[PDB]
Amino acid sequence: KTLGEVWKRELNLLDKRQFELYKRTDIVEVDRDTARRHLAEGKVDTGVAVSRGTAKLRWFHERGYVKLEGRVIDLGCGRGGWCYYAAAQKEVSGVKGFTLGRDGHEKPMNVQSLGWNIITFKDKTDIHRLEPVKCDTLLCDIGESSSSSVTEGERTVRVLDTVEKWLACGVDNFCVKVLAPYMPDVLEKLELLQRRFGGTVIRNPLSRNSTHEMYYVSGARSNVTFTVNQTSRLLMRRMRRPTGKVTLEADVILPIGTRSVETDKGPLDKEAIEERVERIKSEYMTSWFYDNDNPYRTWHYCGSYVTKTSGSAASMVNGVIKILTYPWDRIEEVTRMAMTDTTPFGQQRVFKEKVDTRAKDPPAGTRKIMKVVNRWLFRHLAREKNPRLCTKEEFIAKVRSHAAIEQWKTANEAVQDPKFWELVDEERKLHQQGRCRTCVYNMMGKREKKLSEFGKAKGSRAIWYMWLGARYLEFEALGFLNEDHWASRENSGGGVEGIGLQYLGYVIRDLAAMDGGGFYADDTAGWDTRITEADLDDEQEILNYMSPHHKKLAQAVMEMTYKNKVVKVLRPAPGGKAYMDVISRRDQRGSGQVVTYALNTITNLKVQLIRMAEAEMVIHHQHVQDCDESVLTRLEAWLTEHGCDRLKRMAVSGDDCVVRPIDDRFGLALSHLNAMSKVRKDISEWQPSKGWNDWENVPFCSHHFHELQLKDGRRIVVPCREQDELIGRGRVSPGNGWMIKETACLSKAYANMWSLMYFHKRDMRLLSLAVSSAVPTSWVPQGRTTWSIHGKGEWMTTEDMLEVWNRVWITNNPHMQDKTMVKKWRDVPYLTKRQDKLCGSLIGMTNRATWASHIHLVIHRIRTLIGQEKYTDYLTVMDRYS
Ligand SMILES: Nc1ncnc2c1ncn2[C@@H]1O[C@H](CSCC[C@H](N)C(=O)O)[C@@H](O)[C@H]1O
Ligand SMILES: [Zn+2]
Ligand SMILES: [Zn+2]
Known part of the structure; x- marks a missing residue:
């Protein structure tokens, strides 16, 4: 119309x-x-x-x-x-x-x-x-x-x-x-x-x-x-x-x-970082300048210089794993898995979303509760052990495989040079005078395997490094928390320090043996970005248990390095270079350190302790903004009465936690949890927490756990996760345009890890034997398969996987009384077909059937591509491949 x-x-x-x-x-x-x-x-x-x-x-x-x-x-x-x-x-x-x-x-x-x-x-x-x-x-x-x-x-x-x-x-x-x-x-x-x-x-x-x-x-x-x-x-x-x-x-x-x-900048102690920032400024005088276009809103920006760009946004495909895993080529949960964008751009936008937040200081009453629960917790952690300095010899011995780290080219080459330890002695003297000049954080990107966003790679989380001397000073001052197992389950009740992925499920099952409500395992949205200045001062309670000579050094690390940080971050720059920005605040920490894990476990113990105190109506919402000595003494007596019981109701590894509380009121105790900025991920700020019914479904350290029965009726607790995660992570290679020799060793490492921890998943065992059947037998597994501190690396050997299997599961398992070894691979059990299907197995589908029949042609393809070498047909250890 x-x-x-x-x-x-x-x-x-x-x-x-x-x-x-x-x-x-x-x-x-x-x-x-x-x-x-x-x-x-x-x-x-x-x-x-x-x-x-x-x-x-x-x-x-x-x-x-x-x-x-x-x-x-x-x-x-x-x-x-x-x-x-x-x-x-x-x-x-x-x-x-x-x-x-x-x-x-x-x-x-x-x-x-x-x-x-x-x-x-x-x-x-x-x-x-x-x-x-x-x-x-x-x-x-x-x-x-x-x-x-x-x-x-x-x-x-x-x-x-x-x-x-x-x-x-x-x-x-x-x-x-x-x-x-x-x-x-x-x-x-x-x-x-x-x-x-x-x-x-x-x-x-x-x-x-x-x-x-x-x-x-x-x-x-x-x-x-x-x-x-x-x-x-x-x-x-x-x-x-x-x-x-x-x-x-x-x-x-x-x-x-x-x-x-x-x-929205907060206080900054310029005098504390002046020497370090002037050292960086002097070492790069030719490029130093103040960029008036810096994107930092909550971090104090001090200046920038120019270096070469680093990192990659590309994800390399492991060829043999990707060819053997062809039936998954159409699943998005595996194909969306890729490497993390370590370019200064993706680094900087991850810094924008997650690191450049503004922290809420815990209100007065919540802070007082933090002081009481914290002081009690440290009094209980130090009941038996005594803080101690760690030695140069312990450090050099630890340089075999350490983490969180120009005159030398290798760590071992530096610890053999007395001039290095001269520098260490000089910076130690400076720390003893209350000065710090070289302990600076280098915030470089972590090559992780994450799910792609939009259809492109997700930005890379950052892991904070320091030069070798600063890490030695940290290790000398506070390394006793690691070397003396302060976060152990024996010393802390809720800690799991030392226990590998293998035996972690026994802890959750033990928690399931107790009385109480459902399981709660809440993830914190960016735990390291939510560690408040209050959490740092609370963690400084270890200084009150040290000798003066030790307390001075440790105090120097905690105050001058953890609070008055100096951090160097990469940001994209014109041309092919990059800006190195020197920024600082007081209220975050970095995951790269090995003392980070201990203090995160302790601080999370304090956090879950407080939340459980709110769940049992010792404290509640009115006590957030302030708190009387009455209810504070109530909380004191509550810690005295049930503190060690509540601690034993926890499985805490860093920011990961699993709590079995007295009752489900835990799911509604959110006032102090939110006040301490420990906001839960993927949930509304005041929405009740997801409970868990069957302990075998409780998530902890990226896994859940199942109870399996061996051929001879014995029982073991095995780890399990979504098979799509395992395949998507196995399908990706870190290096650029690599030689088929490197990625074949990586693939053999993945196959060995699957054989050791995930043997009970049928696609995973068939995949392991197929991989170790297409890869030359004399080649040694190299590369990184996991980032978990609970991955002890037992699969990275040239040994027979059946013998390391019997070792970790039968021979060295404290929960296995009868030490009778398992003879053949076919006697190693699987999960129930129902549980296997429920955890991502493709059994039942005709594509996996055709895959299992034609897997040998693909194996031959990969052998052809690798070239002429000595192979072995491991698949014969299966029933349908004799
Ligand atoms: N219901 C909805 N709510 C929000 N966005 C929507 C929407 N329906 C469509 N869109 C998005 O709106 C976009 C319109 S294109 C217009 C935006 C701009 N010109 C640009 O693309 O750069 C589409 O790409 C589509 O993805
Ligand atoms: Zn220093
Ligand atoms: Zn499972």
């Missing part, structure tokens, strides 16, 4: 070619081929616009139709082009982008365009339910082209109705996609918006003639019906004259880099 509807009918009538000639008739078009090539090849530092629509917005921007100012909100950001264009503008202070980005639609894109650090994307979000927030620039580009004008009208009035809520909040500028402005209802709603907010609809000359879309912008007014019918007129006159000749305009190229932001 309307002229636009006539355009819709006449448009549907056109065939393919006439559609193609009317699509580009007299429109303005940017050439996207170069940018599309850049984004196909994975280049994210070129600055090209990530979508056509960007240019659209640019038009509206540079002729006054919309101003981009202040806080920008983008409803339906898609790839994110409008967010990037807005973020590259000086007049913009922040950008929040939301999009569905699921089920076919385009997912957000992470690129280095200018202002990338002031954008916050959130996919899998329905904008129609998102409560409007106050902003200064409201953008919306939502609307799907349909063939029925009724569909366009209903979707359009839905969009405008939702946008009306966001406009009610009082926005200065806006640009809202009106998909079908020719429909009468859309005209009425638009007219009401014109009376209530101003603005008008504007046809964008970059819009293809295949859509009738116009844009409600705030920088002009006109008669809605008149200009809409004029745009319909133009679209019809263009349909009648189908020339397809396009007007030309240049595509969008934006600059790269970060932008400054409003800061």
